[PDB]
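Support case: user asked for a sample of complex input and structure output to validate their parser. Sending the pair below.
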Amino acid sequence: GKGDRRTRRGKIWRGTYGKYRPR
Amino acid sequence: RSLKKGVFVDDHLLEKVLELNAKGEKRLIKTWSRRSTIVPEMVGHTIAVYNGKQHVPVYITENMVGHKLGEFAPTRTYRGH
Amino acid sequence: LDVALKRKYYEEVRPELIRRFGYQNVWEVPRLEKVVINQGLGEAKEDARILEKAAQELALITGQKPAVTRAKKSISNFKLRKGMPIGLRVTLRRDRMWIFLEKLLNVALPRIRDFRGLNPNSFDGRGNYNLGLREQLIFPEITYDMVDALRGMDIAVVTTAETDEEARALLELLGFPFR
Amino acid sequence: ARIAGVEIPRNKRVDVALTYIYGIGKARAKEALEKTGINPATRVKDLTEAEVVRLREYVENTWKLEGELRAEVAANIKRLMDIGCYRGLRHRRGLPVRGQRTRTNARTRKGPRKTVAGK
Amino acid sequence: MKEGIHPKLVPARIICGCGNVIETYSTKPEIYVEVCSKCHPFYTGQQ
RNA sequence: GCGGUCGCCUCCUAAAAGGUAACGGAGGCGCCCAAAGGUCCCCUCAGGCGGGACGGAAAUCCGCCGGAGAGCGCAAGGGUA
RNA sequence: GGGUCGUUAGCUCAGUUGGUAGAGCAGUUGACUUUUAAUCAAUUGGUCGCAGGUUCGAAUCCUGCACGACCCACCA
RNA sequence: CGCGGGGUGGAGCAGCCCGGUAGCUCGUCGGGCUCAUAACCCGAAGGUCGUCGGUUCAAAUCCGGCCCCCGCAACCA
RNA sequence: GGCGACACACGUGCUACAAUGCCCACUACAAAGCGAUGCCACCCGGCAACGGGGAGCUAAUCGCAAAAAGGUGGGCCCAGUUCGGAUUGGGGUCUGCAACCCGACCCCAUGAAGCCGGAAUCGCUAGUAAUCGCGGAUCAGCCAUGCCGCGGUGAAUACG
Ligand SMILES: [Mg+2]
Ligand SMILES: [Mg+2]
Ligand SMILES: [Mg+2]
Ligand SMILES: [Mg+2]
Ligand SMILES: [Mg+2]
Ligand SMILES: [Mg+2]
Ligand SMILES: [Mg+2]
Ligand SMILES: [Mg+2]
Ligand SMILES: [Mg+2]
Ligand SMILES: [Mg+2]
Ligand SMILES: [Mg+2]
Ligand SMILES: [Mg+2]
Ligand SMILES: [Mg+2]
Ligand SMILES: [Mg+2]
Ligand SMILES: [Mg+2]
Ligand SMILES: [Mg+2]
Ligand SMILES: [Mg+2]
Ligand SMILES: [Mg+2]
Ligand SMILES: [Mg+2]
Ligand SMILES: [Mg+2]
Ligand SMILES: [Mg+2]
Ligand SMILES: [Mg+2]
Ligand SMILES: [Mg+2]
Ligand SMILES: [Mg+2]
Ligand SMILES: [Mg+2]
Ligand SMILES: [Mg+2]
Ligand SMILES: [Mg+2]
């Protein structure tokens, strides 16, 4: 869900980028 | 919460401690810098920290390694309800 | 009648114990009798038919059919009519003792989470030592697809050792992981 | 078969059944599955004791797991308290450690609510 | 042992993290060992 | 009168045989068991201390120690390993 | 001990072809309202004095025996 | 002195009688509806049973004592 | 230092309890506003935050940019479970004089409550509700899930 900072759907929510949402 | 290129310690006490570190003698110094780091080198002193109210003594060990100087000088009063 | 650890006792455990303490007589040297295993189960009381898996899987790991304890007095707090079965108690001796005791030391205690070693103080002062277990599946014969529910036991081991010192010596040198 | 402690996973996936080991999941899994070369999509019911020992051995040695690990996570705590440290009080008497807000819901760290009375 | 209905207790074979474990003599022969604290990871010979 | 009591067992009273009174001091019975019976063969307590998973004063297990303080269906006395 | 009678899935019951099985308040569901109701609308098998014995079949007849309610009597 | 019943959550009652678990109304606490309060609705909390022995495996429950409580009685003189 | 207290109590919201659903890969469609004190395409190292470098644009030019849902393919197989990410341990990034009180973010470990919510009670009549992103102001950074806005797909129902 949009609250897992460890997932794609999550990082999109926060607005941030990571290993699960690389730029 | 790190720094790393960094490791900031206010130089009010840092001078007094590095001077107490190699001193020959030690007693309790009273600082307002809780925003500091503590040690690697400060360990073994008594130091009076400040909560907003007064100056609390802190005996220092290595278990106190990086912990900013005021974790050991609490700002509250509780005792429950 | 062979049983490697039994052998290793006679050849190399016995003499180390003679050199270490020193003995007029061959008998004075500590020998190892009666490792008695006892499951206290309240775990099956009012339902006493839960028992016989825990009894059959006892005999599976020792190799001996256990007999059944019953109740000394009646104690109201947990149940305990003076009749009922509390658990199984199997007495092991002689080869059949060792055949289980080596399987204990090479398999069981390895298979415990942690296992930082056997507590050193369980010697009773007259030089026997007992301990206790929880998951019975630390044994080889227990597959965790045969477990209905977990229950442990208390293992007492008796020794002709007159003292606790020699008790630990005998057990250490039998390869008892210790502290 | 089984990983550190016991922790038998089974059926389902292998990568998945690994999370069910403590101190491990997702990341520490999918990578330690290539580092044994084992298929991640494998079904842990069926697979060769070959794959198991190379997996069971890799993991048990590599990083600290619950029997050892939980011991050590607790270990920082008794140190984080008993020193006199701030987080140690929030541990000692049991409130939220990292910042946040205690006027309203702590509920996880606080237990269930013990209500009393108004003005 | 008294004669009837009581497990066989026949010589067996078991394994470890390293190779085999000898003495055995168990009813329900041929079992398997995950780990040994004397083959010794996981305790003795420390790490 | 009102109250209490009214037969049976145990203990004291009772004065070292028996027996022995009072509206003298205290308690129990009006049953229970097809095993709690016959016999043959085994077995020996309570308790305390140490030990030992969930077991805590007390469940179970293991040691030493324990001559009877336990048990004997129920009251007391005698008796009894 | 006689005589009548029972005897009923949660409770009350209501059932003597040899078939099923309920009818009421209950319980849950679901409409209604506010509140309390009151009305409405939905159910597994639950092998029904007890084992026996009658037959094509017996909740469901016959002897048995446990029981209950009732009523008669009698008590050295 | 005498015979009878009783002492249980703050109040008032059950439960004891037939050992094993404590219930009912009100009060009270949190919430609800209301501008608001009551009424009402949804939730909850709260006691070792006068006390002290004993009995039992287990005592509010059975037994003894004591402490209160209520009731009856105290006649011929 | 506090405004951040925590036995508790109400209000507004976010994420949810899963299979019209979650995870991964690939491919596609917006509007609006911001920005050469700044927005950083692009190369490098970094798992990543980010750090390097560095090109362009006072901007219908160049940058924030990625739109998300969806679309396709694959996995999960009804599990407190690949649901859900609360809490906690540890390791670092950056802003800043400084991150203990008390910051935002990345990764590793941890994986909590929760199986559609009692009495009650809210919004919405159409490009509305639901649901999906995105921008901006304030601002060093940020506790924004806020508020002001923007398009994306797109219901149900009104007897009375
Ligand atoms: Mg998830
Ligand atoms: Mg959603
Ligand atoms: Mg001995
Ligand atoms: Mg915070
Ligand atoms: Mg009279
Ligand atoms: Mg009279
Ligand atoms: Mg006499
Ligand atoms: Mg005489
Ligand atoms: Mg007899
Ligand atoms: Mg004893
Ligand atoms: Mg003891
Ligand atoms: Mg006696
Ligand atoms: Mg006697
Ligand atoms: Mg009681
Ligand atoms: Mg109220
Ligand atoms: Mg008269
Ligand atoms: Mg402040
Ligand atoms: Mg404020
Ligand atoms: Mg706070
Ligand atoms: Mg919010
Ligand atoms: Mg790279
Ligand atoms: Mg132009
Ligand atoms: Mg952006
Ligand atoms: Mg749960
Ligand atoms: Mg809700
Ligand atoms: Mg309108
Ligand atoms: Mg926004």
